[PDB]
Amino acid sequence: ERIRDLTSVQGVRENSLIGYGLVVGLDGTGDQTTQTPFTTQTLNNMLSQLGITV
Amino acid sequence: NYGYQPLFEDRRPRNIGDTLTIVLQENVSASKSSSANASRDGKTSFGFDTVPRYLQGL
């Protein structure tokens, strides 16, 4: 059980994924949204997608 | 079904038939000008009002 600990197999590799999201349900410890316009912009985007146009 | 739609991404046109708003704001202004000039004035004179005798022949 040492070769598996010393080498890696060609083609058997890991990639990296990134994305943007919103986290809700905080107890008043979220963004101020006055210094972060993108939070409100993306919340409005989500609401518009769901059918609400602010 | 209209396919996958991102939740937080800004609404952009992605496929054929999608609409987009163009704000036409064009302001173009070009100009050019040039000139050239040249001048030349020349005056010359010589007169012998009173000629002494020894200079008369000349």
UniProtKB/Swiss-Prot annotation, chain A:
It is found in: Periplasm; Bacterial flagellum basal body. It comes from the Bacteria. Assembles around the rod to form the L-ring and probably protects the motor/basal body from shearing forces during rotation. The basal body constitutes a major portion of the flagellar organelle and consists of four rings (L,P,S, and M) mounted on a central rod. Belongs to the FlgI family. This is Flagellar P-ring protein. It comes from Salmonella typhimurium (strain LT2 / SGSC1412 / ATCC 700720). The lineage of its organism: Bacteria, Pseudomonadati, Pseudomonadota, Gammaproteobacteria, Enterobacterales. The gene is flgI. The chain holds residues 20 to 73 of 365 of the full protein.
UniProtKB/Swiss-Prot annotation, chain B:
It comes from the Bacteria. It is found in: Cell outer membrane; Bacterial flagellum basal body. The basal body constitutes a major portion of the flagellar organelle and consists of four rings (L,P,S, and M) mounted on a central rod. Belongs to the FlgH family. Assembles around the rod to form the L-ring and probably protects the motor/basal body from shearing forces during rotation. This is Flagellar L-ring protein. The lineage of its organism: Bacteria, Pseudomonadati, Pseudomonadota, Gammaproteobacteria, Enterobacterales.
